[PDB]
Structure formats: structure tokens, C-alpha cells
Design a protein around this ligand. Sequence first.
Ligand SMILES: Nc1ncnc2c1ncn2[C@@H]1O[C@H](CSCC[C@H](N)C(=O)O)[C@@H](O)[C@H]1O
Ligand SMILES: Nc1ncnc2c1ncn2[C@@H]1O[C@H](CSCC[C@H](N)C(=O)O)[C@@H](O)[C@H]1O
Lengths: 314, 314
Amino acid sequence: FGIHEEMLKDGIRTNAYKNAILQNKHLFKDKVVLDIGCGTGILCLFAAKAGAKRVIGIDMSDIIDKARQIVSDNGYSHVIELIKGKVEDIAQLPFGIEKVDIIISEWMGYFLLYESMLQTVLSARDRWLRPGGYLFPDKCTMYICGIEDSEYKRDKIDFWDNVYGFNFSAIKADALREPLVDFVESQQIITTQSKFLEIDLNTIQPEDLKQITTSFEFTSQYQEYCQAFVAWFDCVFSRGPHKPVEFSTGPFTEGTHWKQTVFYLENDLPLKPNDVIKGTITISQNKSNHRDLDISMKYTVNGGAVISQDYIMR
Amino acid sequence: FGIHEEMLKDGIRTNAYKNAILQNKHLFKDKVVLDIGCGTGILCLFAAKAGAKRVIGIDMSDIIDKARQIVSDNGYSHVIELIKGKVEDIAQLPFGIEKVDIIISEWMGYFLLYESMLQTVLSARDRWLRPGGYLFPDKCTMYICGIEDSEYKRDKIDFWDNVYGFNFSAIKADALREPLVDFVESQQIITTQSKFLEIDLNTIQPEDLKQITTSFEFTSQYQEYCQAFVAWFDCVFSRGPHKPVEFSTGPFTEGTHWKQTVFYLENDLPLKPNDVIKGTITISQNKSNHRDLDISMKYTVNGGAVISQDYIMR
Ligand SMILES: Nc1ncnc2c1ncn2[C@@H]1O[C@H](CSCC[C@H](N)C(=O)O)[C@@H](O)[C@H]1O
Ligand SMILES: Nc1ncnc2c1ncn2[C@@H]1O[C@H](CSCC[C@H](N)C(=O)O)[C@@H](O)[C@H]1O
């Protein structure tokens, strides 16, 4: 339903795709393009307008029926073919196509990896992408920093101490364990930013994602309390475009429907300028429900004792 | 997860329940209370504090495990018993309880009836409520009026005419068929209000809800275009409380998590003062997906020809 309105109205995201595709007619002319999760078909339309010989869109949604009408209303029924189905249940691609030159996908989830189609795209890549072929986009980088969020933490967390006079503190750890998807103001940031993960769709393998372990390090700029870490991702169309096309979901630039991801700390960190926060973040699917994402943090401040907190995005 | 944060933070709703319960200790003292869909247990806690002998909460959610801890942390483990389960799959109530004096429930959905627990409450009533017993709340009234919403209609509807130069108009009827749950400003209202439905939980029967047919009539106050109808409901704890307790989800009062429900019109209505809009609204569950709600409108303006529009809440 309205899920497609949201992405189309996400101007930062859609223009990034539009520019990467339409500015590179030379790369798209007469090629075979596969759009994974085509939805309403806007990306397919871009690729057709850019000169592709064939655009094959896959989507498991019933949106497909109306996407075909949109393709026809814009004159592309001979170029764009849409398939209702999960990518995993496609025997052959139509028209006897066996390899494709370009895969377009919008796979990125919240916190990049939450309920993402990454695995589906990697399988499509392994089954169909010709050697040397291109993934639009193909590189995503995650960043993390520390913020001051005293107001929002007292409202979302310490609310549970006294609810109409009752003690609801038994719920507090469950409130803390859920990362919040929300916009953060950049003036709340009180540390440098740390690139802590890069995902390269040209090289990554499916088993690399079973469990992600990574490191992060950032530096306090203020005498201040830190109540949360905030994380976002930048996405780059790097291989293929004549010039690289980029967009960010971070707080320093116009918002996107992914917002940012806020990880509330159990205990506020009192930070002095030049204090160093460094640790590891481990990301993996939840054992009891595979749609859920387990995120585990272990870090220190100036070598202090290890602080550890576990989150579940569900 | 955070669904319970939302209702607790809904002050209009929670205070209405708190006042109806805690202001009527005389009615609750030494009685047996059933809370349908108890969640975190706040309503159970109110009923216990009001003097109930026994409070039985039912919830099909795993929230129950933490709700039991909250009950214990507030000293009520001997009064409040919680059952994980659907009401439809409960053999006997515990402690050999066979009848109950009061049913509390928060059954109201969006547009009152969308994904509501009404049917579950009526079954609990028929199985367990003693003759003459009370339902908290027991009366809900729906209201509807016409609004000016030219800005939001051009953004949510005529957006589809031209999307990055492409014609997406094939989607426009699907955008119009989805009612929007959103807040409306009262100064957008340009008609009188029409009570079009009342639900009396003391008397209503399950088969009465298979298909609801009702009438509405309201009157234009301005020379203006009408782009949508807006609907909300008021809820009343009428039988039981010493004085009636009420709350509204309408635009003239503080917002609630139910917001209001906006029905965009296919064709704007040009209204003159004292123009009369009258018709029928038919509400029933969708044949192909029973979670969905079909809403059909047929109306006239000053006896003009019949205008009809169909909506699906899904
Ligand atoms: N395994 C899978 N196989 C096929 N489609 C999938 C899939 N997993 C998710 N999808 C589909 O991928 C889409 C991603 S939303 C992307 C929408 C489109 N690019 C636009 O801008 O409108 C969804 O519509 C969903 O139905
Ligand atoms: N058929 C059914 N049987 C038992 N519980 C149900 C049910 N249908 C819905 N529910 C439960 O009813 C609850 C309604 S939300 C009400 C929450 C509570 N009154 C509070 O203020 O926190 C949900 O938690 C849901 O799990």
C-alpha cells in the first residue's frame, strides 16, 4: 500500500537513483537490466528511459499488476517485463535471458541491515550478473557517533519508573534494548564520527553476513554526558557511473525515510574532551525469530573497564 | 513492543480509564473484573487499586510475562491473575470463576472498527458477564463532517499524475481508496457534524456487525470546496460509573493515538452555505482479506444525483 508512496516521496533516495541511471545513458544503452524489488516500477522506468534493451523487474508484491499498467501508460511495455514472484522461486528469466549486465536494487533497511533484501540481491548477483557487471548501488558505509539526548531519554526510558503511580521499571530494560528509528539533530552530536562497516556488493559473500563483527572508535569533543549512540549509512553507486553518485541518511543532510538509528545507553557516559570511545559491534540474526536483528556492543572509554550492552531490532 | 508505550502515553485515553475506574471504588470493591487485552496491565492495576477482589487479565501477547512482574512489583500478585491466550481458547477462568461483574476493554480501532477487538469483547460478554454486569467502556459514537484539505489532497493524490515526468495516474484510484489516519485541524471543518453510528456494548449482537448500514446528514457552513470527509468517535463509560466518563478522538480536543480518519473525495464538492449532504455509509469486512474493512459511501447534495465512492482500510 502506502509503502511505495514513502520511497517515491523520499527525494534524496530517488534522485540519487535517477542521477546514477539517467546520467549514464552510455552505460545503459542496449543492455539487459534486472530490477530487484521493482515496486511501482520507477527504477525500471529510469533504466528504460536511459536506453536499456530489456528491463526485468521482480517483485513478490501484488503491486506488480498496477506497475504493469504504469509501464504501459508510459510506452515501455516492449522493454520492461515484470515478474510477480520471489527471486528465489524464478526458474528462468524471460526471453531466454541467462545473464544480465546491471542489477538495480533498493535493498537497504533500517540500520542498513534490518529487514534488508541484501541476501536476495547477492543471490540474484550470483545467478545472473555477468562477470564484470554492475550493481546499482554497490557500496554502503555505516557511521556511528555519540549524542546528547537527555530530554528524549527521560521521556522514552525513565518514564517507566512511575506510571500513574505504579512501578513499571520491570519494562525499562526492554525499552533500552530496542533501538529507535528517528531523526537526530546534528547539534546533539558530541563526538567525531566513526566509519564502522563497509558493505561492497561486488565482493561480499552470503556467509560473510551470518555474523558481522566490526570495530568503532570515536572521540569526545565536549565536557558533556552521552546518552546514546546514533548510526546511519551512506550509499554509493561506485562501479559503473561515469562519476560516482552518493547519498547519505545521516543527520547533517536532508532526511530520508530511513532516518537514523538511536542506541540508548543503559548508563550515561560522562565525557571529557579528547576522551576516546572504542569497541566492537556484533550484528547477527536473532535465533528465535530470524526477522529480528541482534546488535551487541562492547566498548571502553580511555581504556576503562568494558561496558557491554545488547540490543534487538524487532 | 512499543505498541504499549503508545497507549500509556495516550493521556486522553488512559486518564479516561483511570477516572472511570478509580473514581468508582464503590462499584469495584470486592468484585470480579475481567480485563480483555490487558497488555502491560495498567487497567488491571487500576481495578485492583479500586478494590476488586479478583482481576483476570487476558492477552495473547508475550507481554504477559513482563506484565506479571509489574503486577508483583506493585504488590497485587494475589489479586491480579494474567492469562496468556486468545479469549476464544480459554476453557475456564481461574479460581473456579464462572461469572464476572465487570469487563474492561480497550477494543476501539482506527475508525472505531478497523482491526478492533469488538467481537472478542462481545464473546467474553456472552460467556462470562453476569446479568446486569458492566462493560468499561460501553458506548461509542461516530461522527463525520466535511473539510477543506486542498493542500494535502494535491500532495497525496494528484502527486501521481506526474512522477519524475512519468504518468503514474494508474495508481490514483488506489491512493483515493485508502482512508488516511491523520490529525485534521478543526479550522478545516466546513460542515456541521453528523452522528452516524452508535455502538452499545450492553445490547449489540455479533451478527449485527456482519454488515453495518447507517445514514449521515450534515450541512455546509461556507462557500468553499470540500475535498474530504473526516470521521472520529467518542467513547463513554455510561452504565456503572456514578457520573459518566467520556473522551473524544475528534479534532476539537486534544489528540489521541487514534487521530482522525480522512476519506478523500474523488471529485471535490463545491458547497454553498446551507447545502445539505446526506447519504449512507456501509461498513463490512473485506471478502478476500478479513483483516480489511470495506467502507462504501453514497450521498447527494441538495438532492442532486447520487455520488458513490468505495474505500478499503487495509
Ligand atoms: N525476496 C523478494 N523477492 C522479490 N521481491 C521482494 C523480495 N523481498 C522484498 N521484495 C519487494 O521489494 C520491494 C522493495 S520497495 C522498492 C520499491 C521501488 N524501488 C520504488 O521506488 O517504488 C517491495 O515492494 C517488496 O515487495
Ligand atoms: N483475541 C484476543 N485475545 C486476547 N488478547 C488479544 C486479542 N486480540 C488482541 N489482544 C491483545 O489486546 C491488547 C490490546 S492493547 C491494550 C493494552 C493495555 N490496555 C495498555 O494500556 O497497555 C494487545 O496487547 C493484544 O495482544
